[PDB]
């Protein structure tokens, strides 16, 4: 279980079996190896932890809305609170797991600019996940940490990438969502999504034979969050 190419073989199989905790454990062992990851090894580690955290995110939204709808029933709400607290530590420990990979291995290697932006949007994402859950005392700092990750990747991406790269429009989409769903500033959120979008249609000459499907997809989600946010 020290072979790097074998751990990527297991993770690729765990994914087909939809065992995303297994798949996350391989790609964490691949990363800790000092490495600097392939662009497929980056993708496998994304889908893994995205599915892992995303499940706890979905459970959290279900229990958190029951606890709010349970106002007045003392014993159902104390139970929904205790379960929400239980789920949240799981979500928190997953996120501190990923952000430890990103500071000790992923952001520190990163030869290229395509990768640097990818991992600092990923840092912004997983601090957001923490902000989605953070309360009081530590929230202020958790939000600020996500915004400083996004803004570094946003600046690198305006400089070193085309407005159509799925990685630069994926940052715009998530950054816009951070403004809307975490900072409650809808006007910036829509200015950012609309600007990313109009800058991308403006230069549709620069679409690839390989990426035109994936960037066209993100351009639609920019204008769908836009249409959603304006009602």
């Amino acid at each position: 279980l020290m072979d790097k190419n074998e751990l990527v073989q297991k993770a690729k199989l765990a994914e087909q079996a939809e065992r995303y905790d297994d798949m996350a454990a391989c790609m964490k062992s691949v990363t800790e190896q000092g490495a600097e990851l392939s662009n497929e090894e980056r993708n496998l580690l994304s889908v893994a932890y995205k599915n892992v955290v995303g499940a706890r995110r979905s459970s959290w939204r279900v229990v958190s809305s029951i606890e709010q709808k349970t106002e007045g029933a003392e014993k159902k709400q104390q139970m929904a609170r205790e379960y929400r607290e239980k789920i949240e530590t799981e979500l928190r420990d997953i996120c501190n797991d990923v952000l430890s990979l990103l500071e000790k291995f992923l952001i520190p290697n990163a030869s290229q600019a395509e990768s640097k932006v990818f991992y600092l949007k990923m840092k912004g994402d997983y601090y957001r996940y923490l902000a989605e859950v953070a309360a009081g005392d530590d929230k202020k700092g958790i939000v600020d940490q996500s915004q400083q990750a996004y803004q570094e990747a946003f600046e690198i991406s305006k400089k070193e990438m085309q407005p159509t790269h799925p990685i630069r429009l994926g940052l715009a989409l998530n950054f816009s969502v951070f403004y809307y769903e975490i900072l409650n500033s809808p006007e910036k959120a829509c200015s950012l999504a609309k600007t990313a979008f109009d800058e991308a249609i403006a230069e549709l000459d620069t679409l690839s034979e390989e990426s035109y499907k994936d960037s066209t997809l993100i351009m639609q989600l920019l204008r769908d969050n836009l249409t959603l946010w304006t009602s």
């Binding site: 993708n43 990685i167 998530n174």
Partner: peptide, 10 residues
């Protein structure tokens, strides 16, 4: 609905 996000799988 809710806000959409991507880690865009490429």
């Amino acid at each position: 609905w809710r806000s959409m996000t991507v880690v865009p799988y490429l």
